[PDB]
Motif scaffolding. Structure first.
Motif, PDB file in Angstrom:
ATOM      1  N   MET B 576       0.823  -1.208   0.000  1.00  0.00           N
ATOM      2  CA  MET B 576       0.000   0.000   0.000  1.00  0.00           C
ATOM      3  C   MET B 576       0.864   1.268   0.000  1.00  0.00           C
ATOM      4  SD  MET B 576      -2.960   1.203   2.685  1.00  0.00           S
ATOM      5  CE  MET B 576      -1.816   1.126   4.062  1.00  0.00           C
ATOM      6  N   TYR B 577       0.369   2.299  -0.675  1.00  0.00           N
ATOM      7  CA  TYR B 577       1.129   3.514  -0.914  1.00  0.00           C
ATOM      8  C   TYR B 577       0.260   4.693  -0.463  1.00  0.00           C
ATOM      9  CZ  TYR B 577       3.564  -0.040  -3.711  1.00  0.00           C
ATOM     10  OH  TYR B 577       4.208  -1.202  -4.123  1.00  0.00           O
ATOM     11  N   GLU B 578       0.774   5.505   0.456  1.00  0.00           N
ATOM     12  CA  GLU B 578      -0.019   6.578   1.066  1.00  0.00           C
ATOM     13  C   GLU B 578       0.420   7.969   0.593  1.00  0.00           C
ATOM     14  OE1 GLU B 578      -0.761   6.469   5.237  1.00  0.00           O
ATOM     15  OE2 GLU B 578      -1.461   4.385   5.256  1.00  0.00           O
ATOM     16  N   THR B 579      -0.538   8.724   0.060  1.00  0.00           N
ATOM     17  CA  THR B 579      -0.255  10.034  -0.519  1.00  0.00           C
ATOM     18  C   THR B 579       0.133  11.058   0.550  1.00  0.00           C
ATOM     19  OG1 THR B 579      -2.549  10.866  -0.444  1.00  0.00           O
ATOM     20  CG2 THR B 579      -1.928   9.555  -2.356  1.00  0.00           C
ATOM     21  N   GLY B 580      -0.558  11.030   1.686  1.00  0.00           N
ATOM     22  CA  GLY B 580      -0.296  11.996   2.739  1.00  0.00           C
ATOM     23  C   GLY B 580      -0.884  11.657   4.098  1.00  0.00           C
ATOM     24  N   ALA B 581      -0.435  12.384   5.118  1.00  0.00           N
ATOM     25  CA  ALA B 581      -0.904  12.196   6.488  1.00  0.00           C
ATOM     26  C   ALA B 581      -1.769  13.371   6.945  1.00  0.00           C
ATOM     27  CB  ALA B 581       0.276  12.013   7.427  1.00  0.00           C
ATOM     28  N   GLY B 582      -1.762  14.442   6.154  1.00  0.00           N
ATOM     29  CA  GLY B 582      -2.501  15.645   6.482  1.00  0.00           C
ATOM     30  C   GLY B 582      -3.995  15.405   6.510  1.00  0.00           C
ATOM     31  N   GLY B 583      -4.748  16.394   6.983  1.00  0.00           N
ATOM     32  CA  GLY B 583      -6.193  16.283   7.005  1.00  0.00           C
ATOM     33  C   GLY B 583      -6.738  16.301   5.589  1.00  0.00           C
ATOM     34  N   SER B 584      -8.053  16.234   5.458  1.00  0.00           N
ATOM     35  CA  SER B 584      -8.675  16.429   4.160  1.00  0.00           C
ATOM     36  C   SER B 584      -8.893  17.923   3.920  1.00  0.00           C
ATOM     37  CB  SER B 584      -9.994  15.662   4.076  1.00  0.00           C
ATOM     38  OG  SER B 584     -10.767  16.113   2.986  1.00  0.00           O
ATOM     39  N   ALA B 585      -8.549  18.721   4.942  1.00  0.00           N
ATOM     40  CA  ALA B 585      -8.805  20.171   5.015  1.00  0.00           C
ATOM     41  C   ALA B 585     -10.061  20.583   4.244  1.00  0.00           C
ATOM     42  CB  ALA B 585      -7.598  20.956   4.517  1.00  0.00           C
ATOM     43  N   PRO B 586     -11.240  20.360   4.852  1.00  0.00           N
ATOM     44  CA  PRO B 586     -12.553  20.567   4.227  1.00  0.00           C
ATOM     45  C   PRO B 586     -12.792  22.024   3.879  1.00  0.00           C
ATOM     46  CG  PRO B 586     -12.723  19.315   6.292  1.00  0.00           C
ATOM     47  CD  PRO B 586     -11.363  19.924   6.255  1.00  0.00           C
ATOM     48  N   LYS B 587     -11.945  22.898   4.413  1.00  0.00           N
ATOM     49  CA  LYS B 587     -12.034  24.325   4.167  1.00  0.00           C
ATOM     50  C   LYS B 587     -11.855  24.623   2.678  1.00  0.00           C
ATOM     51  CE  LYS B 587     -10.082  27.086   7.192  1.00  0.00           C
ATOM     52  NZ  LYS B 587      -8.977  27.781   7.910  1.00  0.00           N
TER      53      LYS B 587
END
Ligand code: MG
Ligand code: MG
Lengths: 739, 735
Positions: B576-587
């Protein structure tokens, strides 16, 4: 089988008119002979000048005979401090000897002709450190003995506080120093080389005509770049003031008599750049070489009109306003770190400052943090890695910290300490070549500019070879790991790594734990261990050895002067130096005027022990080993019971300390249960000494507070001296027993 | 076919992927690569959860659970993108977007009546929190800087503040009394069942944790932080920092050591404000003040007290700073100090941040000053100090020249410290802390504890440790980099690991390889001497150091933690390959609905693809992916050289074109390529068709407008209305 015991100068000479009878009696039952050898200034002078002497005035040249004796494998020498005579001392020894009727000639300080030429060079062989070069034939084994290590722990010396947030730090160069430009090789053949510059224009100046090299010899070509040094200075100066901290410069000008006064003087010339630029025209006129300290600048401007001189002194002080604050040598008398390069001595100042919790003295007499500036990066990074460890972890705990003994490479003026006569201030930009003067082949080329400092180093294969053997030896005999301190990224130290890896195969290293790592990796590996109460042998080149046998001792013991100073001779013999210090003329004064001798003999007590232990090993001798093992136990006790001499008059002096040593030793040889036949001989002495302990100390105290005629100074009287130094009737009696 | 699964998530990540997915398929169809979708949105996961309440065209595949099974297929290939850890009101705002769309689903309002009200409560807790990541992270971490990003860094170095060689900044940790300095551990040869039992000095028996299954080979620890030692530490170090004139700071991680670190944190406050607290303690107590969660809650609760007292409390607090040191500030302006919450100065972000800045934290005056960084727990703090000393000496790092520090990280099955949530206790009364066999009554490991010490038992299983070794080896093999295990031989637990590693290394061909074991602090220094020389060193570490070091070094290398390969090489062989750890920042979902603009989150995906292809390359030996990887990496690389990455603006940039532009570029290099005649291009529908018209797609959708477009829904959205937006041209889908 013989121990040769040197009869040197002044104080430790007097000590041994006392101690040697004790030594002679304890050692007899082990079949150990003890031969005197006189190498005083006085003796060494009368040797050189036998041409001037009557027949039974003449004296055997002992230093010479000692020298030959370096080659005999059985040889066993205990070498005490002795005078490395200044001119003033020699002229005095000369004048005293003349009075005693030895018609040697005066000292023609400035020759006027004929013999005065040749005599002043023949007195020259006597001036300075004549003796060490003849005796020191084969690398350093250096460590603190159990006796001292253990007393240290029960009785810890003072260690100032290292604040977690200290701003003290080492500052060295990052490029343009000797290290970063350094080039080196091991020769694969014998060669005769010259050190030759080729002027940028093509002119070929020879700086060093002929230097003989042997196969296997490692040579380095290294130079300090004046431009880099000066930028680094200016940058670090500015830096220091912006940090609001003492600026200090740690250098070894007393060894590197050519190399370092230059590096030093450029700090001065720069710090006061503004004043030198306006007055360089007069300083040059006045013959002011600030390389030898600012001190001289002031002495010469004194002849100036009070108006002109007041201007220079104002102009100098003016530099302080844009320059950082300077570390002081004597805060009260205004002596700065620029007064003489021979004042702040690197291998002693750095541990001193780290003992003091990273502090140095400001001109207001109070301690502040300091930038310790050591331009040449090679050997400075060591001290910085420690400093980082001490902020983190506080200062060292002598109650519980381990030991760091040093096996040091130094034979035949190894490495940096041989290149005094192969260092040059470059005349003009050019190419600096080490060139085979027979084949014309150029071995190492340097890119140099005007006023750069160029030097050629060498270390021979047999020294290196012995040094690897001694490392493996000490590892085996002690259980400690041994770490080779050698940077791969330093050409010279790579060149050593090539040798070390190969010669380790020539020895049985199976039980042992021997490693080669970076200087700074070795320094931390050692630290992580010391602090956990583990021990580690440092195996290092010549300069690191001089550095680390000051540094680690200071932390472990508070001095660098209660250490085993062993030179295992190349031929398989041994030499045991009882001390690095002087012969302490001041103690001799107290003896003459008021019959008290505050000379400490702890160094002799310790030399004697290994001397015996090692003779105990080679010659396979049980007796000896016991004499070592017990003289071990006694010296601890002498230390536990405060029986080392006092510096007072009335109280116990050198003699009483010998007595108590004689006592605890005899007692130990009486209470021991390894050799019954020894007990028998020693038990009666142990009882005679125990019983009359106080009658004797009284007999000794009795003599103090009055003068003492020793029939000379540079030429003492052996009758008179043996009287004064062995005055207790009861004690002398006790020795005459032992059956 | 050999296939690659792709996740459709939530919010702005979900959006950006309806855009760039069909522009995959394109460059991957000639490679023999399929692209199945997988909807595991917050919205799609409740639909499988609660499916008893819907009709049967209204019914969905449980897409999360399917991926659960897929972790054991040796060839699977997954690209996971950010998704919402669903929450309080964000499941309720999305416990309604179908009732509006027609789906017969339960309401969920607590304080429930008589029991399918506690059971629907429990029954949609399913989809609360990070409920999707523990399904997918099946086996340790491969985390490195991808070639594209590292190179852009050396060309475009960010700012590194100067480090004075006289900085007063330092780490301050406990030298005794702390978890580390009193640790105990062992490796089991037998599977056991244990309890955690206190034995009161009087003899009383307190069971803290009744049963814990331990398997063979497992490594367990028993460690304790001694409250007396911790508070003496705080006291001694508060004095020190004040006599110093430096800022005082507290770097912990309360967000994951949810039980342990708040306690440690709370003690620093109560000790800081001891004068005020030893006078209002009775009152703070009546009110519920638990400053373990920060001063924040204290000020909110004294608002009830009348103004005369409240302000007398606020004054007594403030009067402490006369004999205390200055605090680091979370927000100078709004007066938020270290101590507001324990979730603000989070250690593994705050500490690299600080070091980058030249060893600085912020004073209350908005200015920057030196700092004592207090990490009480010695175990994972010493490395930072080691760096700081290095930088004091040599200046800060140079991004232009410096090397990389990838990280092979042990973490499988909540390895080490990160699984001891349910096994950590604040000790009630002095006594004896036992890990004891429920079957044989043997006491395996014991500690002496007092009142208020923290005690936890950590475990790591053998199956993770074996993979973690094989992974360190294969990374060393496939990169030519040296790899150092970071392991204290003087720390029981890590020394227990050194024994496994030493044993397990032998089970792989490591003949070419350079693979050593060093103490954390040795390891740290060593890899530090190499980066400064532009040399690379894989770091092989524990679970906490895997969390720490993957922030510390990429902050120095790239000035962000968020541009990294996050590969979880699966236990079965796949990945598995993960793009990021950040939020989805719904803003940024609104900036793509109220107007049209979104966020920069596209970059991670480009890179998740470049490796997903490269490793697919040799796994099912396919010359046809090794290409697309290295050409995709070329492409993404110059998508950075040319500032073609997403904009905050509205002219503009976002994935829309950065999107497109690598189609232009990942074709650019596919036609101009020559090793190959198969993929000779063939991808010559030609790159220069996106260059025929290469300033127009840009303008065709520049006119796209902003103003409004509607996704017609937020969580659950249809599949016929974000075409007319994310896919707005006409000239676009054409070529
Ligand atoms: Mg010395
Ligand atoms: Mg992290």
């Amino acid at each position: 089988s013989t121990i040769i015991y040197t009869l040197t100068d002044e104080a430790p000479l007097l000590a041994t008119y006392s101690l040697l009878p004790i030594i002679e009696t304890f050692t007899k039952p082990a079949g150990i002979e003890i031969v005197k050898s006189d190498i005083s200034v006085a003796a060494r002078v009368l040797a050189e000048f036998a041409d001037y002497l009557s027949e039974e005035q003449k004296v055997s040249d002992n230093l010479a005979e000692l020298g030959r004796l370096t080659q005999d494998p059985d040889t066993n020498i205990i070498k005490l401090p002795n005078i490395s005579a200044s001119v003033a001392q020699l002229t005095a020894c000369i004048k005293e000897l003349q009075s005693k009727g030895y018609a040697i000639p005066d000292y023609p300080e400035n020759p006027a002709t004929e013999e005065e030429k040749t005599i002043k060079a023949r007195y020259g062989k006597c001036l300075g450190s004549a003796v060490n070069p003849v005796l020191r034939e084969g690398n350093s084994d250096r460590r603190a003995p159990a006796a001292v290590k253990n007393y240290a722990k029960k009785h810890p010396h003072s260690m100032s506080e290292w604040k977690q947030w200290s701003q003290t730090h080492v500052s060295h160069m990052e490029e343009g120093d000797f290290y970063h430009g350094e080039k080196s090789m091991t020769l694969d053949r014998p060669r005769n080389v010259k050190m030759e510059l080729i002027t940028n224009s093509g002119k070929s100046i020879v700086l060093k005509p002929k230097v003989a090299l042997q196969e296997g010899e490692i040579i380095d070509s290294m130079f300090m770049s004046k431009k880099a040094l000066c930028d680094f200075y200016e940058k670090q100066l500015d830096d220091c003031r912006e940090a609001g901290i003492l600026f200090s410069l740690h250098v070894k000008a007393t060894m590197m008599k050519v190399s370092h006064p230059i590096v030093f003087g450029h700090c001065v010339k720069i710090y006061y750049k503004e004043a030198f630029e306006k007055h360089g025209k007069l300083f040059d006129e006045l013959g002011i070489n600030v390389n030898n300290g600012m001190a001289g600048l002031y002495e010469k401007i004194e002849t100036l009109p009070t108006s002109l001189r007041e201007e220079i002194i104002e102009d100098l002080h003016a530099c302080q306003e844009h320059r950082p604050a300077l570390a002081m040598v004597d805060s009260a008398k205004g002596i700065t770190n620029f007064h003489s390069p021979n004042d702040i001595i690197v291998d002693a100042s750095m541990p001193a400052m780290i003992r003091a919790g990273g502090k140095m003295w400001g001109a207001d007499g109070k301690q502040y943090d300091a930038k310790a500036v050591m331009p040449e990066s090679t050997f400075a990074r060591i001290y910085q890695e420690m400093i980082n460890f001490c902020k983190w972890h506080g200062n060292f705990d002598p109650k519980t910290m381990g030991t760091v003994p040093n096996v040091g490479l130094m034979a035949q003026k190894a490495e940096e300490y041989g290149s005094h006569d192969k260092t040059f201030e470059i005349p003009e930009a050019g190419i600096a070549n080490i060139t085979d003067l027979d084949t014309g082949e150029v071995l190492l080329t340097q890119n140099v500019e005007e006023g750069d400092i160029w030097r050629m180093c060498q270390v021979k294969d047999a020294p290196i070879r012995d040094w690897v053997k001694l490392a493996v030896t000490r590892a085996r005999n002690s259980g400690m790991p041994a770490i080779f301190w050698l940077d791969p990224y330093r050409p010279h130290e790579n060149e050593l790594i090539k040798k070390v890896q190969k010669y380790l195969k020539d020895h049985d290293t199976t039980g042992l734990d021997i490693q080669i790592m970076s200087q700074v990796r070795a320094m931390r590996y050692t630290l992580e261990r010391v602090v956990r109460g583990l021990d580690t042998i440092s195996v290092t080149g010549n300069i690191l050895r001089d550095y680390l046998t000051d540094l680690f001792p200071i932390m472990e013991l508070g001095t660098s002067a209660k250490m085993l100073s062993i030179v295992p001779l190349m031929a398989g013999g041994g030499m045991y130096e009882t001390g690095a210090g002087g012969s302490a003329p001041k103690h001799v004064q107290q003896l003459v005027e008021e019959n008290h001798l505050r000379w400490d003999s702890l160094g002799e007590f310790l030399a004697l022990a290994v001397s015996l232990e090692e003779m105990g090993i080679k010659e396979n001798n049980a007796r000896t080993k016991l004499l070592a093992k017990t003289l071990d136990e006694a010296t601890g006790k002498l230390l536990d019971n405060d029986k080392s001499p006092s510096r007072r008059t009335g109280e116990l002096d050198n003699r009483g300390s010998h007595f108590y040593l004689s006592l605890y030793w005899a007692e130990a040889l009486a209470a021991q249960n390894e050799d019954a036949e020894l007990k028998a001989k020693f038990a009666p002495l142990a009882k005679a000494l125990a019983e009359n302990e106080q009658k004797i100390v009284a007999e000794l105290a009795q003599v103090q507070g009055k003068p003492a005629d020793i029939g000379g100074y540079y030429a003492v009287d052996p009758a008179k001296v043996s009287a004064v130094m062995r005055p207790s009737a009861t004690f002398n009696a006790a020795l005459s027993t032992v059956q």
